[PDB]
Amino acid sequence: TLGPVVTGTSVIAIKYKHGIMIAADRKASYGSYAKFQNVERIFKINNKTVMGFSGELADAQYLHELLTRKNINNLSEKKRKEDMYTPQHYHSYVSRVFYVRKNRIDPLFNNIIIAGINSQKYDNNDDNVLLYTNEEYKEIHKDDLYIGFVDMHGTNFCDDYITTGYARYFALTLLRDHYKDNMTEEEARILINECLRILYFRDATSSNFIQIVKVTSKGVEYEEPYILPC
Template sequence: MASLSLQAGGSSSRALPSESTVSAMSGTERTTRPITTGTSVLGIKYRNGVMLAADTLVSYGSLAKYKNAKRLLSINSRTLVGGSGEYSDLQSISDLLRANALADRCTADSLYEEDNNEECAKEVWSYLRAVMYQRRNKMNPLWNDVVVAGFSQNPDGTTSDKPFLGIVDKIGTAYEDDILATGFGGYIALPLMREKYRPDMEEGEARALLEDCLRILFYRDCRALNRVQIAKVTEDGVLVSDPYELDTYWDFKGYQSNKGEMGTDGGW
């Protein structure tokens, strides 16, 4: 607090606080809730790789603020990351992982052996688990659920043919599975994926299933959009599609009939 100094003549004046006093008064600030958020990310293993899917909407509360935000990120030639939650925190995670990937390449024995020096997906997943848990312990979490997809690594540094799919949440809880979903997709899309999933699915079947789930999420999730991205990891590398729009169907009888049987348009 500012000190009170008495001067001759009985008048008083308030001394200006020092920089250290101002710093002590303001304290340490923490993000208490996410502001601009993305919704569900879906992941699935199939015969030859792993596939992720997400829409491109970032919402500011109930406002559809950014409609072309890419939430599927290529970290290196064998790892994909998709994130829901606070978009600025996802950008921070992306910068951190790409800085690590650049450091690995710069400190490698040879710049011409990139594949042998890149982190595999499971290593990225384990690292994110530690980062999320450390930030949570400092009461300053990254407000994201992150899905990591790719392949494991053999002891000699080569890429394994065993696909990997894992998730890490904002408090450091992490697990692996054949199918994963974050956000509202954990309630709507995940049961549909469990019903249709087979370990030997072809790439086209996996993509069709993910698109169907994204379409249903667009119908049911107020923070979802029909503009989406699909990304895959195979032994040949990583491929992230450009955003595109899903076809939708609105001619269901339930959408056309009057609500409440009051002869109105359904509004209240």
């Protein structure tokens, strides 16, 4: 609320065929100490939406309670799968929250990504939802996908690839050089690994113990964390 203390590094989000891919290093640095090297920095609101994080951890946690409990209220007044809120809804909600906190001058020292799938014609997961506990992938049109961004100042937009932190110079350059449309999972993961390798080799606050999450027709898939090949 007054300044950053415990900081995360950066996240990368890209859309491809069958869904989107979002990645983040599991580390939160206490300045120049690196106290925590196993932190969950990618969160889930519901199926077909996730929340990114690069900044102060307390604000991300507060926004995580707000967003996940907004999803709880959505489920508690749900009757059909189409009544589930889209990533546009949550992205606008975070944008309004950041704008209001800016006007009050009590900001959140974070740079959020909201991304997922803004359509329901591809899977029947949301008709009978499963919060606690939990085929072939179905190709998803890029128009039905969505990736968004929220700045400290509330600035927002949408694009096929969005990154935060120091990845907005390194990884954004690699994506603008190399990002195609409808790349398979292997090519996307190779590109993400190359960008995170370049970040690890030239960013103190980053690391190699990477978390990777996917948002597809099957739903949100928290894969096993892996150390980068380097």
